Amino acid sequence: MKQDSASNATYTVDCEDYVHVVEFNPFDSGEAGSLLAYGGISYVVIASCRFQEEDSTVEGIEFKTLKTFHHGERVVAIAWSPETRCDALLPLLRFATAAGDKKIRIFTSDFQDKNEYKVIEGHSGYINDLVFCSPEGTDIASVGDDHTCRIWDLDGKQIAMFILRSPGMSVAWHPEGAFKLMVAEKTGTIRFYDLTTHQAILSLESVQVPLMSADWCVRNTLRIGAVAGNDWIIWEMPRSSYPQDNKPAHADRARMFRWSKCNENVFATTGYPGKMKSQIAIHHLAHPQPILIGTAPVGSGLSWHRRLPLCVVGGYRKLFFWLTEM
Amino acid sequence: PAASETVNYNVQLFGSSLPVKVMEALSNASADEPMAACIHEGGWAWLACNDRLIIWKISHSSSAKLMVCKELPLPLSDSEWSADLVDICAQTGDPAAAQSVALMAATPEGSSRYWPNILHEGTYIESYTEFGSSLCAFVTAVKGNSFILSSEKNQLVRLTPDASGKMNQRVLPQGQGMLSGIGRRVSTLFGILSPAVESTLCSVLWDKGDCFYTLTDSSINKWDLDDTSESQVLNWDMSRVLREYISDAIWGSESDYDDIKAGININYLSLNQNCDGLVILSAAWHPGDNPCQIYYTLVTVKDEGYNISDEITVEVTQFNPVFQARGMQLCQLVVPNFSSQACYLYTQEMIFACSTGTGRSTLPQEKIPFEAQGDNIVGAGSCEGWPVFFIRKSGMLTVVARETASVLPEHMEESLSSVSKSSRQ
Amino acid sequence: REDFLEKLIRVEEGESVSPRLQYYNRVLRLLEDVGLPELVIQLATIAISEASDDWRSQAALRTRIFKHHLDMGHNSQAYDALTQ
Amino acid sequence: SVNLERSYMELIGAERETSRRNFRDLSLRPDVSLVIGGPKYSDCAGGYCYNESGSLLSATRNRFIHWTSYADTLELVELSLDINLLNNAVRLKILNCSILPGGVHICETQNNIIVLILTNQTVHRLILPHPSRMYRSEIISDSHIQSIFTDIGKTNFHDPNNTYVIPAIPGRAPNSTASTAWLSSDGEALFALPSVSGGILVIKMPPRDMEGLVTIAELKQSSVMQRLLTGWMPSSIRGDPGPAHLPVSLAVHTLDHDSYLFALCQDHKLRMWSYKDQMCLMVADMLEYVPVSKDIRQTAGTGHKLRLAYSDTLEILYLGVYLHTPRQGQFCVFQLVCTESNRYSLEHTSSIFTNQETLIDFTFTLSSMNIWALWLDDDNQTVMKHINFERNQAGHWNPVFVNPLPDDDLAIGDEQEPQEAYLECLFAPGRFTIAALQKAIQILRKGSGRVLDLSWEELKKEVTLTVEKEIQNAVVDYDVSQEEFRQINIENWCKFYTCCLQYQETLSRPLALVVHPNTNMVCLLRKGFLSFLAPCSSVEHLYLVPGEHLLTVDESVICDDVDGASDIVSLIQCLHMIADYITEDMAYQMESACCHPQSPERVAEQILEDLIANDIDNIMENIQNKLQDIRNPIQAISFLLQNMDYETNMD
């Protein structure tokens, strides 16, 4: 791995079940504290967290639980809407999860002593990931192990079908665009899906085999950050499909990529999940060495905050937070 | 796709807005093979696509209106088409202004289908064969609107004209030439006595002045054909003089310079005429270490009419593929109308300009190589007296500058209209 | 599944009444030789499902469970695994 | 009546069939008289098989050495499809002379291997190592074994006794494989060459290959001295052979004490003479058995070939005469009826007509009674066809799988991208080669550097660079619509296909074929290219042969019932005519519909819609017309069930 400018956990939060998935707000999902939703094995908790680096009357970190509900089979992916009011004006939390029952479970609540649960017939195989594919929230695209990506809505009908050359690893949605979606493939054929008409507009061929994850830059539609092999790649669309920038990240193979939800030059990655202590590497543009290193006993979860350059990593019933100097 | 051209003067679009000829060729799979087309002045385009001879006409402002393709009937007989098969009838001795620009489309079987004109296609000739073989390779026109077909196995078939619409095909008078016996013969046998093996024919050219040259891989004989018999003039050789020029133009100062100048194995391929002499296309390789590098040499003869002389220019041609048989179509030479001030030689990756004098109506000097296009050039030459080149996925592009077409002042325009015979309503 | 692995299970069978324990032990040894401590711990937790007469493997699995429990922070779970 | 079809499937080699190669750049210098020039015998291919022991468990089994003569040099390479050979490649640059087609002989003695190459004026001889000199291992069967020479010093030999001046009185015409070399009963060697002006040039040489007091003669009619004297005199009659008495090929057979040289003239006359005992044997006329056509033999022509085969399985001699004229063309097979008195009579066994095409290499096998020919036309294309002479009186000539000019197909698709399909079709090893793709990538990238083929990541990066360059050179707006980008990708891939075909057609010119006695293996030598003709099974050969020829083929051999045989033939023809379109979007949709839970009819509908979108011409009409001719498919389904048994573990 890497050890350039290393540090331990600054904010450590203990939980109950094993933490394996954690994400923040994609865009306009709440402008009053860091809203998070994490589910271990049989318990999903919604939390509002405030840090001392954002306000001033916070003793390190202050987390408040809003809703804790026990669900059946464990989840592996959760969809987030880019335009939903949760704590600003009127509360409205409508989110879907891909549990182990091969069916999507979508919960819709408004903090008015009510919470409707609905079941959506997704894919018969193991559903991998899912995310909203609409700026207003009306369609949810999911990918699993069937080579067929079916666009699902709030009712449970098929809108469009996309063919893939591999089981759908991850799905990415552009909130600052116009129905822009990406589906990570093992072969490396990324189709810039424009759901305005449900047609293949552009296709990119990741030349670094194998290809892991890929996503946009939240402040620039042209910048596409992906992880493949051992180095991270930055593509400039639609000027060039070949690797515009390619710089190493770790001494071994990486895992996933996640652009910063606040800037357009810093990002974070993670190599192997553990082995020789999980060292999450925070890198900058045109920088081969990591500008920050966060030490953890194991790696299971990565996300970026929208207010401050903050990252979170889950491990053995714990969550470690880090902040970037930039 | 990809395109990389070299400008020399004023390069403009010969058509208007992307001609449809590129799409037509891509759909017909004609340009997908090593082609060797012919661009004749006035705007004629000839393509010897195996057994489907395509003759069409192109001019200025053509995108979707000029797309007709006239085909010619040709039976299966395995023809060795290259450049001499579909050759214009400008080498004949008949003047006038009709039988001097005809179209050739002979069949390698024994007959000689001679066309009377090209401005009004649809008429042929009646001439059956009596004695001879088949597998005719290169055709040539002599005086009296008659033809000679020469095969690759040393077989000569003469066209005897009896009237204006009834001819015959016979054998060569006093027997055929070279070695390798084939078909029937009469009187003397062969003509080239050598202790080697055979004598592969390369080209046959009849020029004005009762002069005929049979360029082969052995010797050069001059015959004074009188449309009934031949007379041996003098048996000379050109390779013995061309070897020194090839060694001086290609190689340089080395140790075995004398051995190199004495060696250099040369193989003839194409040969045509022009108003300034003759243009030969042959390959040459030094007999040094193995393997040998086949280099292409451009032999240009400078003169004022159509016969031979001593002003010989030898240049090297880059991009050499492979050489095989006696009809390689990868590197082919085609003269536009046998009366241009600058010839164009098209090779699979270059268009070279053979300068034969000053230019009064056509822009000379247009040497353009290719480094971004892998498709071989279909054809090259002069279209309507202007340097027009065909590029795949680009169309026809003209290269003009000072020599154009203006409006004549007073009596000049009247004389031009009178000699052109134009009318209107 | 896989006769290539069935033969490797059969050549090791002979001292246990359930080949599942021996197969789990072999896969755990392979995962330990490969790496990934989290996956090794997960496999060690999953292996405890089928018992056999060979008490050594069961004792090793119980010791590993106790070690993981005392490293994570579960006094009640450690006491239960020890009383088992 | 013998009914048996032997179809062969093409196999691209060269780059696809690698081999440990190592040439020895040693140019040979002639020491005798030269000619300075001569016709460059380009695109010539010859082969010679080794047969030193009848056992099929040694190292020389299925061994054949082939020589490729281009312009004036030779690349003697030894290829074996069983045992690998080390240092089996040597270049020989003969000055001012070209190697004749089929004029290389190898004599393996007990000291050194003697080579004999007949060129235009200089005979070349080389001495290769051998046991009792350098120990060459040819025993037992191993993976790799040594071949010719060893180092670099044993590849250059131009001795005075090794060099020899080739005469020509009055000349020679080696148009094909006609140069023969064989020893007589007195130990003297005889070199037979196709001489012009009628007759065969016979060079008599002392024993072995050492140069000494040699003699020259011309076998034309009677008296070798008189024939050699009259060869310079112009003559063209029956008593005096001339230009109309020269055969294209030659075939000699060792008989008694008089080596009879079979010669087929252009006037349909087969004669035989002995180098030292020429006499008036029997002027056998072909028209005595072939239907009357004296005008054809009076007008003569070119393409008259003759072949002999002494099948020892039944002790029968067969003579195949291919008469090729601008008005007629047919292979006539005769059986030899000897009289034990130096007089042989032919009996017309069969005769099969054919088209008027240039024949290069052709032969016939009596073990299955089938003549197979390969017509290499001058129209940048070649065909090969086989037919049984003892099956049909007319013959329909079943063709063999040929594909010198591969053509792709266009497909606009619907929601997919044909770019990946075209890339996979170009990277598939079933056609083209990696060298053409590398050259196309180097060219279309505005003249880039060297393109490798080992790093998949680097290859993908270079192909992405090329695709993006083509895209920005074609258009600039390719992100506002879904059809414009697909059309631009299709145009770029068509340009790439044309650039690859421009280099593929250059190296896709077949020169000749090579067959080996015992163990059927057919090699195809093209302009610097090697290919294989793999023998296919019964069902595979039936599928390869179109239904139009299977209908003429007797139905009693395929199936038991004529109705079922016709039904299965129509089904095979339907499958073959459907297989004319091969893409990758169909396979992609099939894999997707198989991975996602649905039904086989959905996969079938997806494949049908993909084939419809990829199709450019109509085929459904012919499909229905051939399917409507079904009355009893019992034998058809029986043959289908008793052939596709592949995944069922029955043993």
The C-alpha atoms of residue B285 and residue B239 are separated, in whole angstroms, by: 12
Instruction: Write the secondary structure of B324-339 as one string of H (helix), E (strand) and C (coil).
Output: CCCCCCCEEEECCCCC
Chain D residues touching residue B33 (CB < 8 angstroms): 380, 405, 501, 505
The C-alpha atoms of residue B261 and residue B145 are separated, in whole angstroms, by: 42
User: Which H helix or E strand runs over D47?
Assistant: strand D44-49
Report resolution (Å) to 1 decimal: 8.7
The C-alpha atoms of residue B239 and residue B218 are separated, in whole angstroms, by: 10
Smallest CA–CA distance, residue B91 to chain D, in Å, is 26
Q: Does D499 touch chain B (CB under 8 A)?
A: yes
Contact (Cβ atoms closer than 8 angstroms) between residue D412 and residue D432: no
Contact (Cβ atoms closer than 8 angstroms) between residue A244 and residue A204: no
Apex CA D74: angle with CA D40 and CA B214, to 5°? 0
> Minimal Cα distance from B170: which residue of D?
D299
The C-alpha atoms of residue D10 and residue D15 are separated, in whole angstroms, by: 15
Smallest CA–CA distance, residue A154 to chain C, in Å, is 36
Chain C residues touching residue A274 (CB < 8 angstroms): 36-38
Smallest CA–CA distance, residue A23 to chain C, in Å, is 22
CA D596 to chain centre: 47
Q: Does A255 touch chain D (CB under 8 A)?
A: no
The C-alpha atoms of residue B58 and residue B64 are separated, in whole angstroms, by: 12
Q: Does D482 touch chain A (CB under 8 A)?
A: yes
Q: Does A162 touch chain D (CB under 8 A)?
A: yes
Residues 167-226, chain A, touching D (beta carbon < 8 A): 167, 188-189, 191-192, 197-203, 205, 207-209
SS3 B239: helix
The C-alpha atoms of residue D98 and residue D166 are separated, in whole angstroms, by: 12
Contact (Cβ atoms closer than 8 angstroms) between residue B408 and residue B419: no
Contact (Cβ atoms closer than 8 angstroms) between residue D12 and residue D76: no
Say if residue D334 is exposed, middle or buried (CB neighbours under 10 Å; 0-12, 13-18, 19+): buried
> Minimal Cα distance from B35: which residue of D?
D502
Long-range CB contacts (within 8 A, 24+) of B352-355: B352/B298, B352/B315, B352/B317, B354/B279, B354/B298, B354/B300
Smallest CA–CA distance, residue B296 to chain D, in Å, is 14
Tokens of residue D67, six digits: 């020589």
Smallest CA–CA distance, residue D487 to chain A, in Å, is 12
User: Is there a contact between A298 and C38 if contact means CB atoms under 8 Å apart?
Assistant: yes
Residues 52-71, chain B, touching D (beta carbon < 8 A): none
User: Is there a contact between D419 and A203 if contact means CB atoms under 8 Å apart?
Assistant: yes
User: Is there a contact between B189 and D198 if contact means CB atoms under 8 Å apart?
Assistant: no
Say which of A273, A300, A316 has its CB closest to residue C72: A316
User: Is there a contact between B183 and D381 if contact means CB atoms under 8 Å apart?
Assistant: no
DSSP code of residue D507: G
Smallest CA–CA distance, residue C74 to chain A, in Å, is 11
Q: Are strands D200-205 and D189-194 parallel, antiparallel or unpaired?
A: antiparallel
Beta strands in D355-405 (DSSP E): 359-365, 370-377, 381-387, 398-399
Contact (Cβ atoms closer than 8 angstroms) between residue D96 and residue B265: yes
Chain D residues touching residue A185 (CB < 8 angstroms): none
Residue among D435, D365, D427 nearest D8 (CA): D365
User: Is there a contact between B187 and D234 if contact means CB atoms under 8 Å apart?
Assistant: yes
Give the Cβ contact number of residue B91 at 10 Å: 20
Distances (CA, A) of A80 to A97, A109, A113, A136, D154: 9, 14, 22, 11, 78
User: Is there a contact between D38 and B196 if contact means CB atoms under 8 Å apart?
Assistant: yes
Contact (Cβ atoms closer than 8 angstroms) between residue B162 and residue B145: no
The C-alpha atoms of residue D121 and residue D155 are separated, in whole angstroms, by: 21
Those chains having 3 or more beta-carbon pairs within 8 angstroms of chain B are D
Contact (Cβ atoms closer than 8 angstroms) between residue D508 and residue D431: no
Contact (Cβ atoms closer than 8 angstroms) between residue B176 and residue B259: no
The C-alpha atoms of residue B141 and residue B112 are separated, in whole angstroms, by: 11
User: Is there a contact between D71 and B81 if contact means CB atoms under 8 Å apart?
Assistant: no
Contact call for C and B: 3+ CB–CB distances under 8 Å: no
The C-alpha atoms of residue D335 and residue D320 are separated, in whole angstroms, by: 9
CB contacts < 8 A, A to C, total 16
The C-alpha atoms of residue D3 and residue D559 are separated, in whole angstroms, by: 13
Residue entry with tokens 């590098």 = B293
Q: Are strands B127-129 and B167-171 parallel, antiparallel or unpaired?
A: parallel
D326: cis peptide before it, omega within 30°? Answer: no
Q: What are phi and psi of B230, to 5 degrees?
A: -125, 150
Apex CA A306: angle with CA A302 and CA A309, to 5°? 70
Q: Does D414 touch chain A (CB under 8 A)?
A: no
Q: Are strands A211-217 and A220-228 parallel, antiparallel or unpaired?
A: antiparallel
User: Is there a contact between A124 and D456 if contact means CB atoms under 8 Å apart?
Assistant: no
Say which of B133, B287, B325 has its CB closest to residue D302: B133
The C-alpha atoms of residue D183 and residue D164 are separated, in whole angstroms, by: 18
SS3 B226: coil
The C-alpha atoms of residue A76 and residue A98 are separated, in whole angstroms, by: 6
User: Residue D581: which residues within 8 A CB-CB, separation 6 or more?
Assistant: D409, D611, D614, D615
Q: Does C14 touch chain A (CB under 8 A)?
A: no
User: Is there a contact between D416 and A200 if contact means CB atoms under 8 Å apart?
Assistant: yes
Chain D residues touching residue B184 (CB < 8 angstroms): 236, 243-244, 299-300
Tokens of residue A283, six digits: 């890198």
Residues 152-191, chain D, touching B (beta carbon < 8 A): 166-175
Contact call for B and D: 3+ CB–CB distances under 8 Å: yes
Experimentally, the structure was elucidated by cryo-EM
The C-alpha atoms of residue B146 and residue B140 are separated, in whole angstroms, by: 9
Contact (Cβ atoms closer than 8 angstroms) between residue B230 and residue B223: yes
User: Is there a contact between B200 and D243 if contact means CB atoms under 8 Å apart?
Assistant: no
Those chains having 3 or more beta-carbon pairs within 8 angstroms of chain A are C, D
Contact (Cβ atoms closer than 8 angstroms) between residue A312 and residue A20: no
Contact (Cβ atoms closer than 8 angstroms) between residue A237 and residue A202: yes
Point out which residues pair with B285 in neighbouring strands: B265
Give me the torsion for CA of A140, A142, A146, A147, rounded to 10°: 90
Q: Does A64 touch chain C (CB under 8 A)?
A: no
The C-alpha atoms of residue D267 and residue D281 are separated, in whole angstroms, by: 17
The C-alpha atoms of residue B198 and residue A293 are separated, in whole angstroms, by: 83
> Minimal Cα distance from A316: which residue of C?
C72
Residue among B102, B97, B96, B105 nearest B117 (CA): B102
Chain A residues touching residue C73 (CB < 8 angstroms): 317
SS3 D287: helix
The C-alpha atoms of residue D72 and residue B200 are separated, in whole angstroms, by: 14
User: Is there a contact between A238 and D478 if contact means CB atoms under 8 Å apart?
Assistant: yes
Chain B residues touching residue D244 (CB < 8 angstroms): 181, 183-185
Say if residue C47 is exposed, middle or buried (CB neighbours under 10 Å; 0-12, 13-18, 19+): buried
The C-alpha atoms of residue A304 and residue B261 are separated, in whole angstroms, by: 77
Query: Which residues in B134-161 are b (16+ Cβ under 10 Å) and which e?
Result: bbbbbbbbbbbbbbbbbbbbbbbbbbbb
Q: Are strands B368-369 and B350-355 parallel, antiparallel or unpaired?
A: antiparallel
> Minimal Cα distance from B294: which residue of D?
D71
Beta strands in chain C (DSSP E): none
Point out which residues pair with D530 in neighbouring strands: D525
Q: Which amino acid is at B3?
A: A
Q: Which amino acid is at D138?
A: E
> Minimal Cα distance from A275: which residue of C?
C36
